[PDB]
């Protein structure tokens, strides 16, 4: 259908905050021209992960109605969404980087991370590509992931639900406009989130194989 005036306001707010996304030229130049080693590659990944969290915190705080929620809840939502948001955000790097991806992919495959973890996540990046999601879709999807009622340790789940549902309605409308031909597009995006949820177990296993780590990463990931 067509977005309501309130819905239009919500999308722009999400769009403005999301498009503040940054990739320090410093991180970009490391992947392209840097010591190609398992140790060096792992370090680059950590820097990117740390950078994402800083971006993620800014996007999360700016989220409409996020400031309303309980302070414990805000941390709980932020802690809950970190792995899923990071993988989705990393997935979005088909549009953003072009040469670099081959280097980035190789560095990721040589990080010393086990092969089993690599296949599913890369499959996800390839799988996510099929959707050919717009930037607006990525922003709405990330916000929905962040604003999850289901997250552990939430004192007031219902309050989180109200914020999340408006996003879903907006995202659903976007699918029709962006992809009028496919009526199953909204369902497909939701399905990916289910595939996204898998990574927390996968991410948790990766953590267990010690390799480093940044102070910000440790708090969010509950390291030690």
């Amino acid at each position: 259908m067509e977005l309501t005036p309130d819905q239009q306001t919500l999308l722009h707010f999400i769009m403005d905050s999301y498009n503040k996304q940054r990739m320090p030229q410093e991180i970009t130049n490391k992947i392209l021209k840097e010591e190609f080693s398992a140790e060096e590659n792992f370090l680059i990944l950590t820097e990117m992960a740390t950078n994402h969290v800083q971006v993620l915190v800014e996007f999360t705080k700016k989220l409409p109605g996020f400031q309303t929620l309980d302070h414990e809840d805000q941390i709980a939502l932020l802690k809950g969404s970190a792995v899923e948001a990071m993988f989705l955000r990393s997935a979005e790097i088909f549009n953003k980087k072009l040469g670099h991806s081959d280097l980035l992919e190789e560095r990721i495959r040589n990080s010393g991370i086990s092969d089993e973890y690599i296949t599913p996540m890369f499959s996800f990046y390839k799988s996510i590509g099929e959707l050919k999601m717009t930037q607006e879709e990525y922003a709405l999807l990330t916000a929905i992931v962040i604003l999850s009622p289901d997250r552990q340790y939430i004192k007031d789940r219902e309050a989180v639900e109200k914020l999340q549902e408006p996003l879903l309605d907006v995202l659903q409308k976007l699918c029709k406009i962006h992809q009028p031909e496919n009526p199953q597009h909204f369902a497909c995006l939701l399905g990916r989130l289910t595939e996204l949820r898998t990574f927390n177990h996968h991410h948790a296993e990766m953590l267990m194989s010690w390799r480093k780590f940044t102070p910000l990463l440790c708090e969010i990931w509950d390291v030690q």
Binding site: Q54, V57, T60, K61, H71, I75, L78, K79, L216, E219
Partner: peptide
């Protein structure tokens, strides 16, 4: 306290 860094970042600006 626990999660001081996250709270500080959240309460930023």
């Amino acid at each position: 306290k626990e999660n001081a860094l996250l709270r500080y970042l959240l309460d930023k600006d």
